[PDB]
């Protein structure tokens, strides 16, 4: 009677977790809102109804057949990236009862954080899948969650692993497999060994950092000296073109424009591989589809192009409204070692008239003269009578579609 | 860029889609028993070929249903034949059966379940009512499939306000369950030898009607024949990748987007390699012969080249055909290249070496033609309203 | 006062003919290709 124990690796016993970024500012953001106060008022409405029917109480001041019982007051939250599960646990612990978190991730190593969250409480309050944040609307549909929280970047678990890349001060040749999950292709060693000089510059300029005068210098250095068998030869060539790496490594508390070209190249090559421009643009715009009316969206931005992407999305989306923007407190930067430029974007969804609130502040005389021309010339026209355009309508069903649901 | 990818997809989407449906229709007719569990798509700018292969080999797992009346939805593959058998059984129940006894059992069962839910006593006094029970849970699974077909999105059952099942939240014991359905030929036992002795028994049409009419074996035949498990798409340009990811993620889940083919990437093995409209787009600096040889090296099954019908394109495709048929006598016979379609002789193409094609450009391209319903951007850009658009394609299977 | 530049370019993209623009740009690409081929010999 023997037990077959699996031999552990170096990265399993020496695994560290991600520190909690903010807990009390998140619980006010990802929970609190219009969807939360109607949740808390309905729970008090069921409390005074339970004492009305005759249930045992205490002295105190006030679908189909097998799924007959549906759940009560519960507040459904979607987690696009749980990481170490501290932000996913902050919603469920501080929310108490009537709250739920569905968590997604790219890596299978986030099952360890999902396993420990189930052991405290599980089965009906936590749910985990392994997918990107852009594929959330494809597997949950529109108006699916009361709230959606979005984080971005790397956790502290993936930074310290020798197999997961992201090691700058190890003094050893490891493969530069710096990606968040198996849903992407080649790593950075296989990227830089095969990418052309022109393809790398156009991908570096898309993220704002490492502009065209500096990115053409880094791409001159990469493509001219690229037999790259290890990350030791990569970091030698990067630091020879620009300055050396900062003392903090990936986390630099200095200014963005005063950061060296070696740090600007490495934080953009991290952004080139995992496609954080695409995943944050899709993950925010899909979230405004999946939210209910007057739901909350919480985005964490640690990079200046991410602050441009959130600012550009809310002003253009005809339901998104920034409730408030809170930065990181100074005490979290010392003990945990986070970025000083980390902000929290709390975006809410509007039921209607989302553009009338934005027209109060930003409505110039030039935009009024452009608006008259677009009505006169009719440039706001779309397409209805084409072949794919006749099969497309709005969200509310028509009279001809309701008779189709009866037979089908 | 991304604007070039917007215009390229909106201009050529229906044309490339019709070409891929034509070539996959010929592939499903010529090879019925080929189910491509692993698909690599070389040069997958937009995933039109991946979407066409998903529609051909898995019509039921799409977000939106197919136009069932069209000829394009009748393929030769066993998964497509299974889905067509399900839709044909629906048509047989609806149209060729005038009796309302099926509806009688249906509303009797609905009223009986609604009455036993909270009103009647328990079902133990009525003996041997398992025929209601197993068809009830089968109809419940059909109801879950109905919700998936209604919301156009899987995992809709966790969205609604039902209580989640206590136990297995992460889904680990559903993926680590030992399956008792797949039995290797040595694992069978405890049976009478007279069943394995007498062979050639189910050759009667009545026993074929028994084998067709039952629906319990349908899911058991579909669970082993998984049509598309892993799909890898290769695209170097970022705009093409970020639009093809918008296209493919609605209906083809878990597509790994590689950015380049590596010379060390030929050690991974795929069932179907599709290069649609990509051999002409390979630059002059890159060695196209090594790319074609590497693409042939990654085929357990079928390699499909699809391209527009042009002179330079036909020269590229005929050179690639010669390069791959050069690899015949180099090893084991069971892995030698054979062309299934179109050329049946495996010599040089007689239209490529014909007398008339010296001074006549029209007698040079051994191609085929696909017809499609043209969209509004094509009739906007070409000044004529084409109710039927024409796409000439050259292909090689 | 004349129109601003971006609405003028978008209006020229909106209301002009597509087939004449396509034919002129394709024959311009053909003329450039004949110039490149004449330079290559």
């Amino acid at each position: 009677m023997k037990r077959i124990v699996v031999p552990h690796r170096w990265s399993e016993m020496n695994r560290v977790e991600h520190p909690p970024l903010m807990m009390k500012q998140l619980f006010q953001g990802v929970c609190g809102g219009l969807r939360w106060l109607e949740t808390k008022s309905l729970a008090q409405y069921l409390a005074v109804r339970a004492i009305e029917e005759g249930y045992p109480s205490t002295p105190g001041v006030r679908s189909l057949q097998v799924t007959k019982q549906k759940r009560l007051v519960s507040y459904d939250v979607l987690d696009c990236t749980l990481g170490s599960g501290y932000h996913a646990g902050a919603v469920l612990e501080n929310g108490g009862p009537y709250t739920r978190v569905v968590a997604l991730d790219c890596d299978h190593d986030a099952m360890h954080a999902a396993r420990d969250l189930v052991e405290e409480f599980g089965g009906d309050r936590f749910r985990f899948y392994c997918c990107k944040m852009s594929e959330a609307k494809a597997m949950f549909g529109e108006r699916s969650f009361d709230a959606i929280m979005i984080d971005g970047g790397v956790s502290d678990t993936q930074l310290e692993d020798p197999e997961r890349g992201f090691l700058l001060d190890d003094e050893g040749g490891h493969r530069l497999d710096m990606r968040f999950g198996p849903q992407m292709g080649v790593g950075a060693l296989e990227y830089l060994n095969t990418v052309s000089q022109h393809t790398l510059v156009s991908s570096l300029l898309a993220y704002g950092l490492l502009e065209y005068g500096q990115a053409m210098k880094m791409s001159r250095a990469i493509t001219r000296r690229k037999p790259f068998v290890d990350s030791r030869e990569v970091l030698t060539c990067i630091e020879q073109a620009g300055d050396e790496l900062p003392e903090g490594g990936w986390r630099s508390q200095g200014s963005r424009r005063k950061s060296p070209m070696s740090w600007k190249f490495l934080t953009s090559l991290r952004c080139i591989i995992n496609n954080e421009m695409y995943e944050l643009r899709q993950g925010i715009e899909n979230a405004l589809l999946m939210l209910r009316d007057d739901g909350r969206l919480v985005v964490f931005s640690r990079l200046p192009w991410e602050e441009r992407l959130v600012r550009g999305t809310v002003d253009d989306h005809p339901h998104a409204l920034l409730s408030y923007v809170e930065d990181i407190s100074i005490d979290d930067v010392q003990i945990y070692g986070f970025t000083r430029h980390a902000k929290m974007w709390v975006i809410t969804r509007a039921a209607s008239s989302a553009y009338a609130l934005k027209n109060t502040t930003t409505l110039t005389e030039e935009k009024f003269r452009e608006s008259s021309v677009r009505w006169l010339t009719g440039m706001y026209a779309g397409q209805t009578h084409g072949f794919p355009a006749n099969n497309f309508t709005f969200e509310n069903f028509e009279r001809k579609e309701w008779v189709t649901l009866r037979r089908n | 860029s991304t604007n070039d990818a917007i215009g390229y997809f909106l201009f050529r989407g229906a044309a490339m889609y019709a070409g891929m449906h034509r070539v996959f229709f010929e592939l499903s007719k010529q090879l019925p028993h080929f189910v491509p569990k692993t698909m690599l798509d070389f040069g997958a700018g937009t995933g039109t070929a991946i979407l066409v292969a998903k529609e051909v080999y898995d019509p039921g797992s799409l977000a939106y249903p197919l136009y069932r009346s069209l000829r394009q939805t009748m393929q030769g593959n066993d998964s497509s034949r299974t889905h067509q058998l399900s839709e044909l059984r629906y048509d047989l129940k609806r149209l060729q059966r005038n009796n309302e006894e099926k509806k009688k059992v249906r509303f009797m069962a609905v009223a009986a379940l609604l009455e036993r839910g909270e009103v009647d006593p328990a079902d133990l006094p009525e003996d041997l009512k398992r025929e209601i029970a197993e068809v009830a849970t089968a109809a419940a699974t059909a109801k879950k499939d109905r919700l998936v077909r209604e919301a156009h999105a899987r995992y809709r059952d966790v969205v609604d306000g039902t209580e989640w099942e206590s136990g297995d939240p992460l889904g680990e014991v559903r993926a680590s369950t030992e399956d008792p359905e797949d039995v290797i030929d040595g694992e069978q036992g405890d049976g009478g030898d007279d069943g394995e002795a007498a062979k050639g028994r189910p050759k009667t049409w009545w026993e074929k009607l028994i084998d067709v009419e039952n629906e319990t074996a349908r899911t058991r035949a579909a669970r082993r024949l998984r049509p598309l498990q892993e799909v890898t798409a290769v695209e170097p340009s970022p705009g093409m990748m970020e639009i093809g990811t918008m296209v493919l993620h609605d209906d083809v889940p878990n597509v790994t987007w590689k950015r380049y083919l590596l010379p060390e990437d030929e050690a991974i093995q795929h069932d179907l390699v599709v290069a649609a409209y990509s051999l002409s787009e390979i630059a002059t600096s890159e060695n196209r012969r090594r790319i074609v040889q590497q693409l042939w090296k990654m085929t357990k099954g079928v390699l499909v080249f699809v391209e527009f019908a042009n002179l330079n394109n036909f020269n590229i495709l005929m050179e690639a055909r010669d390069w791959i048929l050069e690899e015949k006598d180099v090893g084991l016979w069971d892995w030698q290249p054979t062309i299934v379609a179109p050329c049946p002789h495996e010599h040089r193409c007689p239209l490529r070496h014909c007398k008339t094609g010296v001074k006549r450009k029209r007698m040079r391209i051994c191609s085929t033609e696909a017809h499609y319903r043209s969209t509004f951007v094509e009739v906007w850009a070409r000044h004529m309203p084409l109710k039927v658009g024409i796409e000439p394609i050259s292909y090689l299977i | 006062r004349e129109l601003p530049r971006d609405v003028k370019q978008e209006l020229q993209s909106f209301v002009a003919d597509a087939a004449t623009t396509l034919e002129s740009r394709v024959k311009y690409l053909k003329e450039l290709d004949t110039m490149n081929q004449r330079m290559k010999d």
Partner: peptide, 18 residues
């Protein structure tokens, strides 16, 4: 000016052809 737009998309090799 439609042909000058794609000059930012040419690879650095053939950007200096004539």
């Amino acid at each position: 000016r439609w042909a000058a737009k794609f000059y930012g998309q040419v690879t650095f090799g053939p950007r200096n052809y004539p």
